[PDB]
Enzyme design. Structure first.
Site, short mmCIF file in Angstrom:
data_model
loop_
_atom_site.label_atom_id
_atom_site.label_comp_id
_atom_site.label_asym_id
_atom_site.label_seq_id
_atom_site.Cartn_x
_atom_site.Cartn_y
_atom_site.Cartn_z
N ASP A 2 71.19 44.52 -7.18
CA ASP A 2 71.20 45.94 -7.36
C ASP A 2 71.77 46.32 -6.00
O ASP A 2 72.08 45.45 -5.18
CB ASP A 2 69.82 46.45 -7.72
CG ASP A 2 69.88 47.79 -8.37
OD1 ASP A 2 70.90 48.20 -8.98
OD2 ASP A 2 68.93 48.56 -8.17
N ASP A 38 74.64 41.00 -10.45
CA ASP A 38 74.80 41.27 -9.02
C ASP A 38 73.43 41.70 -8.47
O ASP A 38 72.47 41.79 -9.20
CB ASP A 38 75.92 42.32 -8.74
CG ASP A 38 76.48 42.25 -7.28
OD1 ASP A 38 75.94 41.47 -6.45
OD2 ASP A 38 77.46 43.00 -6.95
C1 LIG Z 1 76.25 48.98 -4.14
C2 LIG Z 1 75.81 47.85 -5.05
N1 LIG Z 1 76.96 47.31 -5.80
C3 LIG Z 1 78.09 48.25 -5.69
C4 LIG Z 1 79.37 47.57 -5.26
C5 LIG Z 1 76.67 47.02 -7.16
C6 LIG Z 1 77.72 46.51 -7.92
C7 LIG Z 1 77.55 46.21 -9.26
C8 LIG Z 1 76.31 46.41 -9.85
C9 LIG Z 1 76.16 46.04 -11.28
C10 LIG Z 1 77.33 45.54 -12.04
C11 LIG Z 1 77.55 46.01 -13.33
C12 LIG Z 1 78.65 45.60 -14.07
C13 LIG Z 1 79.55 44.71 -13.50
C14 LIG Z 1 79.33 44.26 -12.21
C15 LIG Z 1 78.23 44.68 -11.47
C16 LIG Z 1 77.95 44.20 -10.07
O1 LIG Z 1 76.79 44.41 -9.64
O2 LIG Z 1 78.81 43.59 -9.38
C17 LIG Z 1 74.84 46.27 -11.91
C18 LIG Z 1 74.71 45.93 -13.26
C19 LIG Z 1 73.50 46.11 -13.89
C20 LIG Z 1 72.46 46.63 -13.15
N2 LIG Z 1 71.29 46.85 -13.85
C21 LIG Z 1 70.84 48.07 -13.21
C22 LIG Z 1 70.51 49.03 -14.32
C23 LIG Z 1 71.70 47.35 -15.17
C24 LIG Z 1 72.40 46.27 -15.98
C25 LIG Z 1 72.55 46.97 -11.78
C26 LIG Z 1 73.78 46.78 -11.14
O3 LIG Z 1 73.98 47.09 -9.78
C27 LIG Z 1 75.22 46.92 -9.14
C28 LIG Z 1 75.42 47.22 -7.77
CL LIG Z 2 79.52 45.63 -6.66
#
Ligand SMILES: CCN(CC)c1ccc2c(-c3ccccc3C(=O)O)c3ccc(=[N+](CC)CC)cc-3oc2c1
Ligand SMILES: [Cl-]
Ligand SMILES: CCN(CC)c1ccc2c(-c3ccccc3C(=O)O)c3ccc(=[N+](CC)CC)cc-3oc2c1
Ligand SMILES: CCN(CC)c1ccc2c(-c3ccccc3C(=O)O)c3ccc(=[N+](CC)CC)cc-3oc2c1
Ligand SMILES: CCN(CC)c1ccc2c(-c3ccccc3C(=O)O)c3ccc(=[N+](CC)CC)cc-3oc2c1
Ligand SMILES: CCN(CC)c1ccc2c(-c3ccccc3C(=O)O)c3ccc(=[N+](CC)CC)cc-3oc2c1
Ligand SMILES: CCN(CC)c1ccc2c(-c3ccccc3C(=O)O)c3ccc(=[N+](CC)CC)cc-3oc2c1
Ligand SMILES: [Cl-]
Ligand SMILES: [Cl-]
Ligand SMILES: [Cl-]
Ligand SMILES: [Cl-]
Ligand SMILES: [Cl-]
Lengths: 287, 287, 287
Positions: A214, A212
């Site tokens: 960030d 996704d």
């Molecule tokens: C407000 C921004 N939105 C909230 C609804 C998100 C949502 C999810 C993430 C994810 C993430 C992690 C696991 C499964 C799905 C997601 C996704 O995004 O939809 C992330 C998954 C990994 C990631 N890396 C940052 C350390 C680490 C793997 C960053 C992520 O940031 C997200 C932001």
């Molecule tokens: Cl999300």
């Protein structure tokens, strides 16, 4: 007789490698305690591969508590010369979209609380991490992706992975700051794993799976929560096809890696100068 | 009767000060355990100087495990009022070349895992590190360099030292990022040493010895590996001439340092409010 | 029967809330040891508020050693749904002057050595910190400031707080760097407090009290040392008026916070999968 030249370290969404034949598990003791889980050995077209689930079975570990030194030490004891780390990441760039893959060539270690070397307490070494992800393995990953004929997304090479401590996702101001540092994707696990693999003279590169944006994107609308695991599951299955292709290429091409000799001009303490306790703890890493 | 007003903390390539007369070693116990090695006391033209090898004999310690609090506490117990830290650094700037010296005026602490204060557990103090390297000592270093008539290189003042945790050298993306933060040289040891020296009311400045470009330069060609220790050895011998000159100037000029009173408006906990255990642990730092 | 919906965490200069009626102290045991001090409960116009002095009585703790997990866990056990953190900060921006207040909307965690999650060792959760300071509480703070009719200064909203490890104040190069990252104010305490409050499903925002420019200003002239505590004391008394107004608004308006459900889609480990020891340690945070 348990030996593998190639290891896959599986991230979020990768708890097994279904396609391996004659699967068998090995519990490896290390001077750093136990790896994240029993290492699974199996053959992909007759090529022996070691598979290690970074977060353990059931996804039991957070990024900060993964036993990185045990995991890399254990793979070293199997004779692994090549590691592909398969990791879920967030995108910091408009053009890197969910379900894309990214093969980074650079990394920035923002982690805080992880032991990030095998050295100290009796032995001093300073490996170069100038190129922290082996370009010979990264090039294989790029051609492996194309060979896998993935239906969804595209693959991007030459990106910078910023690794943060976790476990919380980044604030918007932190995301903005990582963008200003020219980072492209964000994850929590590939440091200190890349440093340790280098100290262990193992070629190491990352296949990143964009799960996704960030938080620099207002996911606010009710359309964000559950698709996010379903795309993590789709990424993971695409990743398996890519790994199949990559293992094939590594096995046939056997590229020379600068990682393979990384310890030899970096080691400051002569082996004859180490204590018995130090030599024993570092045994698998030393020539 | 063992007292010295001036201390040299020697970095990579500096394991002794050959020119001191009536050398004698002192083992100092501190509340923070043992310093990196026995402190050597000797006279340079009748001026008593304390010499501490930061990495210990045989270069046994990595930057992360140096006992910084013991080392600074021990030098405090000898009455040291001035420290010159002599440190090997990488260059982040084209115009800072191998064998040059650099006298930084600023520092950025990127270290992660080091205890970086003597305070806590019973006593609160907040010293200012706005000017973290004493300009009166830095100015002496500049004139000392000129007085030493060094054949190779030049000396640059007014640079920013970024201190990283180590032990691995920086990735290219990290080097790029440190450049964007306007840092000029990179090392692994002068934090928390500069913070601790300030808390100990000791004037502290750095003579940095450029040993190579950081990795932001493709050292790829076979022309890089062994010259790098030989230039570390040449730097170290040039550094000795500079130190000779600097000790002379400090002894005759005795500059007033803002470090000398750094604890007095920074200490929050009144000495009469400390426990017996706290006062005892902090004894040498307190008025 | 001791319950409070609203808590104030008081920073430097705030050791009590004088105006509360029927004050009574509660010692709360937590799985993370003791909070910084006994929590004081009292009524501000019949509204029950919990007051926690972050640094303990007598300002005994440095920022690095504050027991952040105990403090947030203890406030959770009282049923607190809203926290206002009241913190002394340095300004990184010309227009944010001493005696001004600042209600930041963003934060950057530069701390190094603090445990910054309740998770790990048996339970995995990844809360989003995209908006790390609850805008419903921040909006209340802005209107509370105006309602308090403060004579000195102004209040600024929509700023970025950078949190550093401490205890020393920043070097000039670090201050310059925080400016380049677009941070506006600097403090040492609101991380990991904001992360932990989010994991505990408690709405959390900061009322920052500008106590001086960070060091990016040459305070050199004899006109700087003692005014700095006197303005910390004036800030603290202005802060009390603001808190009075803010408690009133929170009590009457009871805004819905996204923090209130932060754990429910972030928790990876099912409660039925936790060990007895893990569930017990996390009990107050779990549904
Ligand atoms: C407000 C921004 N939105 C909230 C609804 C998100 C949502 C999810 C993430 C994810 C993430 C992690 C696991 C499964 C799905 C997601 C996704 O995004 O939809 C992330 C998954 C990994 C990631 N890396 C940052 C350390 C680490 C793997 C960053 C992520 O940031 C997200 C932001
Ligand atoms: Cl999300
Ligand atoms: C504290 C961090 N600083 C940053 C420069 C370092 C870094 C490296 C060295 C090395 C060193 C550096 C790079 C590659 C190989 C070596 C090595 O060592 O073989 C050294 C290599 C040899 C050496 N001497 C020990 C007395 C050899 C006489 C000292 C070395 O000191 C280093 C210090
Ligand atoms: C790919 C870039 N190349 C690899 C051939 C190098 C090579 C060496 C360094 C050194 C270094 C350290 C000890 C002895 C010699 C060198 C050198 O360069 O030639 C360094 C020595 C110190 C240093 N500071 C960074 C922390 C720490 C002192 C950085 C260094 O970076 C280097 C990069
Ligand atoms: C948690 C980090 N924050 C950032 C501002 C700080 C920083 C400093 C203080 C000081 C303080 C600050 C600078 C120099 C001297 C002092 C001092 O203290 O003498 C203080 C000085 C006195 C004091 N009071 C304790 C109750 C005195 C009544 C409280 C102080 O609180 C501080 C908090
Ligand atoms: C050279 C720059 N000058 C020195 C005379 C100062 C002086 C004070 C601070 C303070 C500060 C802290 C407590 C009480 C008063 C002050 C003040 O300024 O006057 C600070 C108080 C907090 C602060 N935040 C930085 C972490 C933490 C609260 C930064 C501060 O920076 C200061 C710089
Ligand atoms: C190591 C850091 N990486 C960065 C992406 C992450 C981050 C998040 C997850 C999540 C996850 C992420 C965000 C919100 C909820 C979840 C969740 O979990 O409910 C996950 C959610 C479920 C999950 N599976 C476990 C096998 C479910 C089948 C795995 C998850 O893995 C994550 C990994
Ligand atoms: Cl799961
Ligand atoms: Cl050596
Ligand atoms: Cl080199
Ligand atoms: Cl006080
Ligand atoms: Cl001041």
């Amino acid at each position: 007789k348990n030996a593998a030249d190639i290891a896959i370290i599986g991230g979020s969404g990768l708890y097994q490698m279904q396609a391996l034949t004659n699967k068998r598990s090995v519990k490896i003791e290390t001077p750093y305690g136990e790896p994240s889980d029993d290492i699974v050995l199996g053959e992909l077209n007759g090529v022996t591969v070691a598979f290690l689930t970074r977060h353990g079975q059931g996804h039991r570990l957070t990024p900060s508590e993964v036993p990185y030194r045990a995991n890399i030490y254990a793979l070293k004891t199997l004779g692994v010369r090549y590691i592909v780390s398969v990791s879920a990441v967030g995108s910091l760039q408009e053009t890197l979209k969910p379900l894309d893959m990214v093969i980074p060539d650079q990394m920035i270690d923002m982690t805080k609380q992880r032991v990030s070397t095998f050295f100290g307490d009796g032995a001093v070494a300073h490996v170069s991490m100038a190129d922290p992800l082996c370009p010979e393995v990264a090039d294989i990953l790029i051609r492996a992706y194309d060979n896998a004929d993935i239906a969804d997304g595209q693959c991007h090479a030459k990106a910078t992975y910023v690794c943060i401590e976790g476990p919380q996702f980044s604030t918007r101001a932190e995301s903005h700051w990582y963008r200003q540092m020219q980072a492209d994707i964000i994850g929590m696990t590939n440091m200190p794993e890349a440093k340790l693999a280098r100290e262990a003279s193992i070629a190491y590169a990352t296949l990143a799976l964009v799960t996704d944006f960030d938080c620099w994107h207002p996911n606010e609308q009710a359309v964000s929560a559950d698709y996010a695991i379903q795309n993590l599951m789709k990424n993971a299955d695409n990743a398996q096809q890519v790994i199949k292709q990559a293992v094939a290429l590594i096995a046939s091409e056997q590229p020379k890696s600068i990682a393979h000799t990384a310890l030899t001009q970096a080691l400051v303490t002569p082996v004859e100068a180490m204590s018995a306790e130090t030599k024993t703890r570092l045994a698998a890493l030393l020539p």
